[PDB]
């Protein structure tokens, strides 16, 4: 029994409180350096020019921000795509001026969350359960990597990434409405149908199970105590929930199989958020949503306006305002 025998048996030990595993050799020291820089940069980071115009933007709490208006800014436009670690600044004064701690948090979020995917698998292999939960977690990883990496990659700079803050994400959404028109993008329409229908079916499947519950408790006790942990009897009636819900819409639709049903719960949000994450990231490479401006034309030739035109009149309002001095030239190519 080697020293490496007492080690690998401990790393892949299922008896630990929190599983470490071999992805946790990546995940823990990469996520702990992303939380720790985030707590420090959200509290104490000095202001940063996002636009490379030398107008710094105050993100931290100590310089007069709220929790909602505060953020961790993205890097400088002047950096661009360049890997900008601490050691390639000349001082940490300068690293924190140019938006250094964005790349420190983002590149460690996305290694640690990718390593949080494998750990969801690696333990599902260690406990003998069917190993596909991490494929459902692929949809937020797809979504986060499209917003923090691929949209910076497609647009040329990390300053285009989403900033790490509540009012900061709202700035990211509006500017991405103007140049890109995400609302008229069906890859965005599909995943809002995965978030509406996602929380539709979570409310449905929650209300059909909790309606058909079998009598164990009294009036004076929570109904959750009718389920002891680790039972062998089903805690509710499938036949009464299905007989309810079949009369709610259709007999032949609204089907029987409680095992095929939870696959449909697993599919419909995850397939939706895969599509928006490819929706953001094709438009990373500037392939925008539907442009129906001045399409409806009468016999004479004059543009008849649609609801698309007042939609793209919003985008003109956000276009002429976003980063209003960083532009020196008429078209917004960069």
């Amino acid at each position: 029994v080697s020293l490496w025998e007492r080690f690998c048996a401990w790393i892949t030990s299922t008896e630990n409180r929190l599983y470490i595993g071999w992805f946790g050799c990546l995940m823990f020291p990469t996520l702990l350096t992303a939380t720790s820089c985030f707590i420090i940069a959200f509290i104490a980071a000095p202001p940063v020019d996002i636009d490379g115009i030398r107008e710094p933007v105050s993100g931290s709490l100590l310089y007069g921000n709220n929790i909602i208006s505060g953020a961790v800014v993205p890097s400088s436009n002047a950096i661009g795509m360049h890997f900008y670690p601490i050691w390639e600044a000349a001082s940490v004064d300068e690293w924190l001026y140019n938006g250094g701690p964005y790349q420190l948090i983002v590149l460690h979020f996305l290694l640690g969350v990718s390593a949080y995917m494998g750990r969801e698998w690696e333990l599902s292999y260690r406990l003998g359960m069917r190993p596909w939960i991490f494929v459902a977690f692929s949809a937020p990883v797809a979504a986060a990597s499209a917003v923090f990496l691929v949209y910076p990659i497609g647009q040329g700079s990390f300053s285009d990434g989403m900033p790490l803050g509540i009012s900061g994400t709202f700035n990211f959404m509006l500017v991405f409405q103007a140049e890109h028109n995400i609302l008229m993008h069906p890859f965005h329409m599909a995943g809002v149908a995965g978030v509406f229908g996602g929380s539709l079916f979570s409310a449905m499947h929650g209300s059909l199970v909790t309606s058909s519950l079998i009598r164990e408790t009294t009036e004076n006790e929570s109904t959750n105590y009718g389920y002891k942990f680790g039972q062998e009897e089903e805690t509710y009636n499938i036949v009464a929930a299905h007989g309810y819900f079949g009369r709610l819409i259709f007999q032949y639709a609204s089907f029987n199989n409680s095992r095929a049903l939870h696959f449909f719960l697993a599919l419909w949000p995850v397939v939706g958020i895969w599509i928006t994450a490819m929706g953001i990231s094709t438009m990373a490479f500037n392939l925008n949503g539907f442009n129906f401006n001045q399409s409806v034309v009468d016999s004479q030739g004059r543009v008849i306006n649609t609801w698309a035109d007042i939609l793209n009149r919003a985008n003109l309002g956000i276009e002429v305002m976003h980063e209003r001095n960083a532009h020196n030239f008429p078209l917004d190519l960069a």
Binding site: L62, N66, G230
Partner: peptide
């Protein structure tokens, strides 16, 4: 002086999560 109140509540939630993971009521099979 409200950045005190902000960091007290943010660290406040981070404390509550720490007790919620490591000092939880364990479920038993029995």
């Amino acid at each position: 002086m409200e950045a005190l109140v902000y960091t007290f509540l943010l660290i406040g939630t981070l404390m509550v999560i720490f007790f919620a993971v490591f000092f939880r009521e364990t479920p038993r099979i029995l």
